[PDB]
């Protein structure tokens, strides 16, 4: 059994069957806890849950076919199974906090995509929307081990460590040396020679992050607010190493709205990028153009992290959830709508040994195993 807790914005019932629009305290989700989930993922006013059985359930706003349920207008208030994938065992669903498209990776390495089709982010050599998941034919001959989705582009990496990107080319987020939109997955040849094991994609004028099995972090794309981590604000269309993170043991990378986050094996969290509304967690709202340790979590061994648009969540090895950032919709879980300028213990989870967190655009998830 897995107990699932949700809070934050719920205007389009993206919390899966709760009453109220601003859930300011983590609330037990009976619909999601009954599913026995291995992963929850949050998009733009949307929520996806992958179960141990390998099925995918979705809820929230259904505009642009972002839920993959065959519809494209209303909202689905109860987690509904993505029946298009019922003949596969899904391992992970990739979606950005401000995303209207998503991908699913099966245990045998197949990738499906669905949702908004703009700029070819779905990867079907086209710009068509997909109300239901569709197999990405271009990735069929490759054993895909991980996936990631931004708001306007997507990524996948092979078992051998090669990274593919596709979608909107503007501001260099795909990393192929130009700014051309790719309607199909294209291998980032610059990163040949590194075994990429993780990738993260941003939103709007987006950055992209990549992590290698040697602990090296690379970044490329839009440079606004220093989210590339190399100072200043200049963008680039070729992967560049973030030298500050070398030797730190980075094991997880994420991209919020205009900011980046890294977590190391020893439990340290680094953030950098746009500082507005305190999404970085350093106590101020100024920008941070090179990665900086979140001092409010020092001494706490963080084992998992999640980023929303303007908020983050971090889980300690002892099951405590810390939150920082904006709170217009209660997504901080401090019982109010007041911003957490620094990492703050979340309410209502004492006795629940949380192991994993997830975030949508303005909502938050925590669950146990």
């Amino acid at each position: 059994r897995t107990k699932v807790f949700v809070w934050g914005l719920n205007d389009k019932d993206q919390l899966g069957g709760l009453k109220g629009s601003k859930i300011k305290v983590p609330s037990f989700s009976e619909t999601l806890s009954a599913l026995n989930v291995v992963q929850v993922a949050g998009g733009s006013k949307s929520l996806f849950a992958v179960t141990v059985e390998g099925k995918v359930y979705a809820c929230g706003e259904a505009t642009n076919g972002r839920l993959g349920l065959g519809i494209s207008s209303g909202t689905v208030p109860i987690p509904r199974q993505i029946t298009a994938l019922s003949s596969y065992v899904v391992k992970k669903v990739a979606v950005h906090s401000g995303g209207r498209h998503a991908t699913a990776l099966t245990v045998d390495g197949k990738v499906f995509s669905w949702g908004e089709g703009d700029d070819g982010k779905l990867g079907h050599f086209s710009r068509m929307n997909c109300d239901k998941p569709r197999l990405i034919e271009a990735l069929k001959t490759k054993r895909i081990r991980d996936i990631a989705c931004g708001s306007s582009h997507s990524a996948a990496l092979t078992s051998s460590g090669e990274l593919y990107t596709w979608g909107l080319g503007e501001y260099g987020r795909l990393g192929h040396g130009d700014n051309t939109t790719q309607l199909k997955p294209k291998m980032v040849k610059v990163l040949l020679g590194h075994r990429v094991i993780q990738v993260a994609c941003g939103s709007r004028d987006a950055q992209t992050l990549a992590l290698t099995d040697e602990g090296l972090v690379f970044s490329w794309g839009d440079g606004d607010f220093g989210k590339l981590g190399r100072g200043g604000s200049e963008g680039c269309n070729i992967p560049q190493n973030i030298e500050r993170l070398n030797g730190q043991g980075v094991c997880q990378i994420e991209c919020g709205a205009q900011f980046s986050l890294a977590l190391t094996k020893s439990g340290v969290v680094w953030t950098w990028g746009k500082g507005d509304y305190f999404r970085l967690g350093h106590g101020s709202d100024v920008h941070v153009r090179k990665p900086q340790v979140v001092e409010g979590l020092r001494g706490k061994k963080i084992v998992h992290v999640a980023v929303g648009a303007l908020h983050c969540l971090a889980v300690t090895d002892s099951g405590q959830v810390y939150a920082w950032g904006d709170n217009d919709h209660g997504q901080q879980g401090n019982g109010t709508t007041t911003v957490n300028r620094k990492p703050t213990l979340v309410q209502g989870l004492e006795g629940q040994k949380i192991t994993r967190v997830a975030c949508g655009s303005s909502h938050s998830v925590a669950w146990t195993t």
Binding site: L9, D11, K12, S21, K22, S44, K45, G98, S203, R204, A257, Q258, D276, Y277, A309, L310, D326, D328, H329, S361, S362
Partner: peptide, 10 residues
């Protein structure tokens, strides 16, 4: 105003 802030539609 932040371009990445949701609006509570109800």
């Amino acid at each position: 105003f932040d371009e990445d802030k949701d609006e509570d539609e109800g």
